[PDB]
């Protein structure tokens, strides 16, 4: 998840820190959004593997 922020030109530190605290609230599907810079749910955004 860190290389996705650097390759997208975003700030890897601010995204990863806010994302790590978000998983402490129980959401397991949250991840990095490549388009907009923010923490979004990849399950509701239909990014699946």
């Amino acid at each position: 998840p860190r290389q996705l922020c650097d390759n997208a030109g975003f700030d890897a530190t601010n995204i990863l820190n806010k994302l790590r605290a978000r998983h402490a609230q129980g959401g397991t599907w949250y991840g990095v959004d490549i388009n907009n810079e923010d923490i979004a749910d990849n399950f509701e955004a239909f990014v699946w593997e």
Partner: protein, 62 residues
């Protein structure tokens, strides 16, 4: 006040017992003097390491 006379066996044996009581006396003294103490031997740093690490995730903002 008080006094304690140590009747021992040999001079080498009773000499070590002299400073041994004075050393252990200051240990019991210092605890009962500052009235609030804390367990030592690295127990303070270990407990703070676990609590402050879970507290870091509840803040954020770098």
């Amino acid at each position: 006040s008080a006094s304690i006379i140590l009747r021992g066996a040999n001079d080498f044996m009773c000499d070590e017992m002299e400073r041994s009581l004075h050393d252990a006396l200051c240990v019991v003294k210092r605890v009962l003097e500052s009235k609030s103490v804390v367990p030592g031997g690295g127990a303070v740093e270990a407990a703070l390491s676990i609590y402050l690490e879970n507290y870091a995730t509840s803040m954020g903002s770098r």
